[PDB]
């Protein structure tokens, strides 16, 4: 009785990898997929060992066992689109190592997922990421102010926003964090009692001058 | 105005406290009274003013004394509510 | 203006009504029971009752609802000239 | 077989069933007349349903509408009260008329009462409105919700655009395939 | 074959039935007479046929109109009572008008209930109106909204094109084909 | 075997066994009728389950509405009593809504009861409300505020963005595998 | 076997077993129906048992709650009931939403009662608000205290984080295992 007998008549929705550890791993691409596979298991359907992954996790796992022994590596995310050869993007600018050292990277790497055969280390430009953001945001017409720091960028977009605004500003972030994840640039949606959408300005013989940004801000009276 | 409110409904509380226990002992003189004379049979009519007159005075007797309390309590806090503003 | 004090007034009539008319089913079986008597010494007690209750709606119904207001002059009043 | 709920209506009894579906809980529904529905799991599965059921606080109550607090038996009516029924009335039909548009699958929408003052003596405020809706896979969304906003402004007296807020969902994936049968 | 819904109105089962024969799921309609009809399902199709009521949240309700709220019954009327039930009169009379003109299948409408204040003491507020209606396959959507609100604009003493509204959709594909039996 | 509880409701008893499983312990539900159900464990599993139910405060109570103060059978209605009904009816038709959008799994909310004073011959002071709300796992919480947000915003006649309180949590571990059965 | 207690309830009867528990004393629960529980002890423990009794002054009083004072059943109400009866009602809906948040386990909440005078002719003064709770091992209480006053906050038309005061404490060490019988 092997396990994709018991997964369901759609058979395609799943994916079953053996590993070198002798246990099955079964790959789902969501939530509710995956727990539609973990009943099986717990149920006690099965008799041999079987464990069920999806990419959030594993991306999770991952990182927290990078926080321990490599506290200073800049990475974007790891990519599992052909779950046997995984992609993990690396920053160029922000590392310095040799490639003796990202071979050695790779092994660990590949010592920790047992049911990959090779990891392909990628380097990315920085630059390219942060545009695409801007870019992103400027085609959707958002209004937003950007901020830089030396480890990561900012997109501040607030104020009393429309429905419309709102709902295409929440598409578009949910699609571009697939894409590079969280770690680089954040994006921070807050709606304000304010019509400026954060605009701000002194009046001065000189006529308007541009405020810098800040916290405070003047709520509306019109 | 609370106080206006509060005066006004404590008025009519008044009344009906004073006045409720004579118009009760009325009463019940009146039904007594109507009973008996048809346990047994008389057509007199002045019998109830009669009694209901010593049922009355007899009542006004004994509470004269809450009443004039009761009334000077009541004028001394509507006075002190009415000039004691700041 | 008769309207409306009718239509204030009308629940105290009402309980007064049913309160006599209850003595007079009464008297039926003590035909020597002067039911008119009885009701004067009651009913004084059951108007300040019930009042009572319904007395402090008194202050929200006048104040806003009868006052006349500012914009009414339009149709009293009208110029002939 | 362990019972997990008795009593039930018919409206429950199929959203219970519907929400273990979907967790891969094959489960039983059977028919007392008088005394209701039953619904029945094996063991295997009973713990499993028994954290869904709490989790998602099953079975449902009832739908609640503001008319349920101001019956017309009443001897006396307020304005208050007729003023209230009348919205209630109204929030109920503009869901029933929403839901025929091309693509809404259903819909919720609020009013707001300010009923909960009479305006006696002072100018009556505006009004506000909100509606929640669903849609068909593959609906274009942000050039939907022009059209809603259109239809429910001229609905009342005095509506801004401003004051009209409005989201948007579409249907989440379809369940088709039967679970499995515990071995 | 397993029991979905029991004690249906007429009106109900012909939706029911309808929605399932659409999602390819072959029902059948049973009559207990006073206990009203029954609708059952094959196995196979048993969880398609959960799944799908609950996400149409069959069974439908019926249709509300306002006065239900305010019956005649009552020995007392408010001015405001009357009013409403004219209101609520007049557009179910229009909504009937208008499923007579040429290629509309159904259509509903919406007036402002400015009774929602008395109009004491204050000058009445001008009238808006919203329509959706549905059309036959081929139709000129774009020319056919001038119509409606020429028509519209004289059926009441103060309206303007600016404050009517009007929503049109086409009728979707015919479902022609009987659904295929499971194996 | 060790009597727990007795004269449950049914309700109230899936409770209990959804938070004894939780910790390991194997319970036993049984129904009697009239006399409700019974809770029962094993007497090495006694000791635990009598600490929890004492941490945990079980069986819980009803649930509490403020509706239930001021019953719609008395006599008269003050306008407190009738406008503190109409408010706590709104709160529960938000709550019921809000339930229906994309992941919540359960919400709460509060509204501002200004009703404490009648505010007759105050200038009425503002609406303030809060809410919570449950959320399925690997949701983006931050993002998902804004929505809440202005979803509330127009369901009252005055609210700033500012007066309004939401706080979100994910749900917890679900516990699929049964507890073991003592040696 | 030396009796203890006659004529407890259920849940005073849970509270004394867990008590006695605690300090190791084996204490057993027997049923009698109409006339409540019954408990007893090892002689050798009897003399601990009473003065764990005494200590904890065994066994608990009922809950008390304001709207008892007033009960709802009146004939007649004052403003004063009626406005108490709304604070205590609101008290225990808060209770019974902040046990919901994470990982609470229970809690308490008290409202400063302006009630007790009509504040008559005065500018009323601003709510205070008061809380306890209790939470699971771990928890961060230091950035927790900050959820608790944004959510109470909002709830109420106007307070201060300066007037709420809020305590929190952690779980004690679970009761595992049985106790000794005496030899
Ligand atoms: C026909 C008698 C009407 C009497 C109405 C006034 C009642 C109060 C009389 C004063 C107080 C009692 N007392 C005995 C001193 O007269
Ligand atoms: C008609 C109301 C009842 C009769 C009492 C009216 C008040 C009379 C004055 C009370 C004086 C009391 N006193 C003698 C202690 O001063």
Redesign the interface.
């Known amino acids: 009785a092997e396990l994709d007998s018991?997964?369901?008549?759609?058979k395609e929705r799943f994916q079953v990898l053996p590993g070198r550890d002798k246990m099955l791993y079964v790959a789902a691409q969501n939530?509710?997929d995956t727990?539609?596979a973990?009943?099986?298991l717990?149920?006690?359907?099965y008799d041999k060992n079987a464990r069920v992954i999806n990419e959030?996790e594993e991306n999770k796992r991952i990182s927290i066992w990078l926080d321990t022994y490599y506290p200073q590596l800049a990475y974007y995310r790891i990519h599992f689109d052909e779950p046997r050869k995984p992609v993990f993007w690396l920053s160029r600018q922000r590392n310095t190592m040799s490639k003796k050292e990202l071979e050695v990277l790779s092994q660990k790497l590949r010592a920790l997922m047992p049911y990959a055969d090779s990891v392909n280390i990628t380097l990315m430009d920085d630059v390219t990421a942060a545009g695409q953001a801007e870019a992103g945001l400027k085609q959707q017409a958002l209004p937003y102010s950007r901020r830089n720091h030396k480890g990561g960028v900012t997109f501040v977009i607030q104020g009393a926003?429309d429905?419309?605004e709102?709902?295409?500003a929440?598409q578009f972030?949910?699609s571009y964090?697939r894409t590079w994840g969280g770690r680089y640039v954040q994006?921070?949606?807050?709606?304000?009692?304010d019509w400026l959408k954060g605009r701000s300005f002194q009046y001065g013989a000189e006529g308007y001058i541009k405020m810098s940004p800040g916290h405070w801000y003047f709520?509306s009276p019109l | 105005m609370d106080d206006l409110v509060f005066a006004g409904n404590k008025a009519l509380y008044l009344v009906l406290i004073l006045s409720g226990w004579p118009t009760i002992v009325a009463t019940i003189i009146g039904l007594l009274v109507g009973l008996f004379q048809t346990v047994t049979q008389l057509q007199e009519q002045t019998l109830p003013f009669g009694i209901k007159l010593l049922g009355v005075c007899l009542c006004l007797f004994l509470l004269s004394g809450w009443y004039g309390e009761v009334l000077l309590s009541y004028g001394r806090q509507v006075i002190f509510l009415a000039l004691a503003k700041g | 203006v008769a309207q409306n004090a009718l239509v204030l007034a009308s629940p105290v009539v009402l309980v007064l009504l049913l309160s006599e008319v209850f003595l007079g089913l009464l008297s039926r079986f003590a035909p020597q029971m002067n039911a008119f008597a009885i009701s004067l010494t009651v009913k004084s007690g059951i108007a300040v009752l019930i009042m009572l209750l319904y007395f402090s709606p008194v202050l929200p119904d006048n104040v806003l609802r009868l006052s006349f207001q500012a914009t009414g002059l339009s149709s009293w009043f009208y110029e002939r000239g | 077989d362990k019972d997990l709920l008795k009593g039930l209506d018919q409206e429950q009894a199929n959203e219970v069933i519907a929400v273990l579906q979907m967790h891969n809980i094959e489960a039983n529904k059977i028919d007392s007349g008088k005394l209701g529905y039953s619904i029945t799991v094996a063991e295997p599965d009973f713990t499993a349903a028994v954290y869904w059921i709490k989790t998602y606080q099953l079975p449902p109550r009832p739908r609640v509408e503001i008319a349920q607090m101001f019956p017309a038996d009443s001897l006396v009516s307020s304005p208050r009260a007729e003023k209230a029924r009348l919205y209630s009335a109204i929030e109920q039909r503009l869901e029933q008329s929403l839901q025929t548009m091309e693509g809404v699958l259903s819909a919720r929408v609020h009013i707001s009462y300010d009923i909960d003052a009479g305006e006696n003596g002072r100018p009556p405020k505006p009004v506000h409105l909100s509606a929640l809706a669903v849609y068909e896979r593959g609906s274009p969304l942000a050039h939907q919700i022009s059209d809603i906003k259109r239809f429910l402004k001229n609905s009342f007296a005095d509506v801004d655009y401003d004051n009209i807020s409005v989201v948007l969902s579409e249907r989440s994936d379809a369940q088709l395939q039967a679970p499995g049968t515990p071995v």
């Open positions: 018991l997964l369901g008549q759609e939530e509710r727990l539609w973990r009943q099986v717990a149920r006690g359907d959030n926003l429905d419309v709102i709902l295409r929440r972030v949910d964090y994006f921070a949606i807050e709606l304000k009692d709520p």
